[PDB]
Design a binder for these strands. Structure first.
Ligand SMILES: [Zn+2]
Lengths: 180, 205
RNA sequence: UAAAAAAA
RNA sequence: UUUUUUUU
C-alpha cells in the first residue's frame, strides 16, 4: 500500500541526491513466504515514532501469531540499511526461531559512518542472514509487489532503471568490500 | 541459449502499415532485460507524419517475458533463428487490425487496419490506454478480451487472437497465464515520438 | 552555485 | 545521515 512517487522518494538514493535537501526517511518491506501451504503475507513498515521499522516489524511478527511447525523464508527489501542496535535485536530474535530464514536487501547503506554500524551488520551476513544491497531484481520485485502498481502512474515508469543501476554499481561494490 | 541471449539486449524494428488507406512506416530501437521481463522501446514515424490512436500499435511489441527456470522459455529458445506471429484484432465497432511480424534483433512488421468508424473512439482518439489483461496461453495460440479505457468513462472492448510460431521446434510447455502491463512513458502532442515500457511475467494456471 | 568519480 | 580527495 505505497505510492509510486514515494517509491523513488524513499528507495532511490544517489551519492548526491535530488534538488530538495535530505527529504528522506526509512522504510522496511517484509515479505513472509510460508511455503507449507504457500500462504504468503506482505507488509511495509515506515520508521515510526522512535521505534525503527526493524523493531516494529519484529513486534508485528510477534503479535501476529506464528506457527512453530514449518519454516519461513522471509525476504526483506528495505530502503535504508538497519543500524547497529536493531540488527542485534534482529539476530537475537532470529536465534530464538530456528524455523525462520531471513534475507535482507537494502537500497542504501545507511549508517553514521562510525565504527559500531560497521560490524553491526557484518555479523548478519556471516552468521544467519545473507545481507547484500539491492540490485535490479530486488528493486523490480519490491517495486510492483509492495508499491501499488495499479491504474495510475506517477511519472516514474523506468526512471529508476538508470538510478537503480547507479545505486547497484556503487553501493553493491561498497557492500561487497565491506563484507570482505 | 543463455550464452547468446545476454541479460541485456537491444533490438531494431521496422514496421510498414496502412490504416484506412493511410500508409505509414515506423522505425524503432529498444533495450531491456529478457530474463527480468522489463523492456523499453523508442519509436519514430518516418512516413505520414498518425491520424489514429497510437494505443492500437502498442500490443504488437513478446521475446521479453520473464519465465521461471523450471518453465521452458518457448520464445527465447527460438533464437537465433527467431519466430513469426500473426494477430487479428476485431474491435466492437467494426474496426479490424491484421498484423504480421517476423523476429530474427531485427523485427519486420506489416500492419493493415480497416473499417474504423470516423466517429469511433479509435479515429477520434478517445482512448486512455489499455487495461491490465491476463492472456491465457495453451504453434502457440493466445486470445484476449482486451478493454480500452475511455475518457468519458466505460471501456472499449476488442477481441484479439494471436498465433506465435517458432522457426525451430522446441519443447512446448504446459498451461500457464502471463500477466502483462504496458505503459506509455513519453510522447509528444501528435504521438510522433513515443517511448514504451513493458513488464511481463508468467504464472501457473 | 551545478555536476562526474573515488576512500574510510 | 556525517567526513576526506581528484576533475569539468
Ligand atoms: Zn535501528
Amino acid at each position: 500500500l505505497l505510492t509510486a512517487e514515494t517509491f523513488r522518494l524513499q528507495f532511490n538514493n544517489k551519492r548526491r541526491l535530488r534538488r530538495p535537501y535530505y527529504p528522506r526517511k526509512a522504510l522496511l518491506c517484509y515479505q513472509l513466504t510460508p511455503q507449507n501451504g504457500s500462504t504468503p503475507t506482505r507488509g511495509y513498515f515506515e520508521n515510526k515514532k522512535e521505534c525503527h521499522a526493524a523493531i516494529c516489524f519484529i513486534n508485528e511478527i510477534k503479535s501476529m501469531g506464528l506457527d512453530e511447525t514449518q519454516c519461513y523464508q522471509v525476504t526483506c527489501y528495505l530502503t535504508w540499511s538497519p543500524c547497529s542496535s536493531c540488527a542485534w535485536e534482529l539476530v537475537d530474535f532470529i536465534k530464538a526461531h530456528d524455523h525462520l530464514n531471513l534475507r535482507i536487501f537494502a537500497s542504501r547503506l545507511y549508517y553514521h559512518w562510525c565504527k559500531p554500524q560497521q560490524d553491526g551488520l557484518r555479523l548478519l551476513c556471516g552468521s544467519q542472514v545473507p545481507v547484500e544491497v539491492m540490485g535490479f531484481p530486488e528493486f523490480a520485485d519490491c517495486w510492483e509487489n509492495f508499491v501499488d502498481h495499479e491504474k495510475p502512474l506517477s511519472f516514474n515508469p523506468y526512471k529508476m532503471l538508470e538510478e537503480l543501476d547507479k545505486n547497484s554499481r556503487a553501493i553493491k561494490r561498497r557492500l561487497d568490500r565491506i563484507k570482505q | 541459449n543463455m550464452a547468446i541471449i545476454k541479460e541485456f539486449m537491444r533490438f531494431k524494428v521496422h514496421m510498414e502499415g496502412s490504416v484506412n488507406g493511410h500508409e505509414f512506416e515506423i522505425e524503432g530501437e529498444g533495450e531491456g532485460r529478457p530474463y527480468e521481463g522489463t523492456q523499453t522501446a523508442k519509436l519514430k514515424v518516418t512516413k505520414g507524419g498518425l491520424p489514429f490512436a497510437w494505443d492500437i500499435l502498442s500490443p504488437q511489441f513478446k521475446a521479453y517475458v520473464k519465465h521461471p527456470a523450471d518453465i521452458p522459455d518457448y520464445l527465447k529458445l527460438s533464437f537465433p533463428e527467431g519466430f513469426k506471429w500473426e494477430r487479428v484484432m476485431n474491435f466492437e465497432d467494426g474496426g479490424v487490425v491484421t498484423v504480421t511480424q517476423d523476429s530474427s534483433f531485427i523485427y519486420k512488421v506489416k500492419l493493415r487496419g480497416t473499417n474504423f468508424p470516423s466517429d469511433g473512439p479509435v479515429m477520434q482518439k478517445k482512448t486512455m490506454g489499455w487495461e491490465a489483461s491476463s492472456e491465457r496461453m495453451y504453434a502457440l495460440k493466445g486470445e484476449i478480451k482486451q478493454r480500452l479505457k475511455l475518457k468519458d468513462g466505460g471501456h472499449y472492448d476488442a477481441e484479439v487472437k494471436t498465433t506465435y510460431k517458432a522457426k525451430k521446434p522446441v519443447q512446448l510447455p504446459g498451461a500457464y497465464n502471463v500477466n502483462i502491463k504496458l505503459d506509455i512513458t513519453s510522447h509528444n502532442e501528435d504521438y510522433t515520438i513515443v517511448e514504451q515500457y513493458e513488464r511481463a511475467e508468467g504464472r501457473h494456471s
